[PDB]
Design a protein around this ligand. Structure first.
Ligand SMILES: Nc1nc2c(ncn2[C@@H]2O[C@H](COP(=O)(O)OP(=O)(O)O)[C@@H](O)[C@H]2O)c(=O)[nH]1
Ligand SMILES: [Mg+2]
Length: 168
């Protein structure tokens, strides 16, 4: 059984808790406490491998945490979340990437770029813009909907695959 330590980062409000609850329990949760930082487990087989996904759902701006720190330096990959209809969120992706690298002290740290809420029409970021950013980073880009559950497993399974690859 393989264990993979993932960290879910991104501006607050983008879909971290929803994305994560969806994978974990298969239900879209709105109303999830914006401040609750918690990690969840999920046993899943990916590509014929039995995996134990230990996910840190991050929360809290400025104020530091033992758990976040640890998961941050010890995490294997990071899901970088932004909201499709929220431009600052998207623009913030570069900072989260920059923080991850500083801690890891490394360029190649696995990540996937998640453009969430692909369910909404109130769209304010183009797939094209996001794809290209993904492409500048050398990392994949997934569009998800924690609401519709669309793309949710892809996102995380892709992240696992990256990790797996980064190991080789
Ligand atoms: N339409 C839509 N709303 C979503 C989606 N994901 C999250 N939400 C809403 O976005 C808000 C923030 O979600 P949440 O996961 O709590 O944000 P974060 O935990 O702070 O990253 C909530 O009101 C959720 O109901 C999504 O995929 N689509
Ligand atoms: Mg949250």
């Amino acid at each position: 059984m393989t264990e993979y330590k993932l960290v879910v980062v991104g501006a607050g409000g983008v879909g971290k808790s929803a994305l994560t609850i969806q994978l974990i329990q298969n239900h879209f949760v709105d109303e999830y406490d914006p401040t609750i930082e918690d990690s969840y487990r999920k046993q899943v087989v990916i590509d014929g491998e039995t995996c134990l996904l230990d996910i840190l759902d991050t929360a809290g701006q400025e104020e530091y945490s033992a758990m976040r720190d640890q998961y941050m330096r010890t995490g294997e990959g990071f899901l970088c979340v932004f909201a499709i209809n929220n431009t600052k969120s998207f623009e913030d992706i570069h900072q989260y990437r920059e923080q991850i690298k500083r801690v890891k002290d490394s360029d190649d740290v696995p990540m996937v770029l998640v453009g969430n809420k692909c369910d909404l029409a109130a769209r304010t970021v183009e797939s094209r813009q996001a794809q290209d950013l993904a492409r500048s980073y050398g990392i994949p880009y997934i569009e998800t909907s924690a609401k519709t559950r669309q793309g949710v497993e892809d996102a995380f399974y892709t992240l696992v695959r990256e990790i797996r690859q980064h190991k080789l």
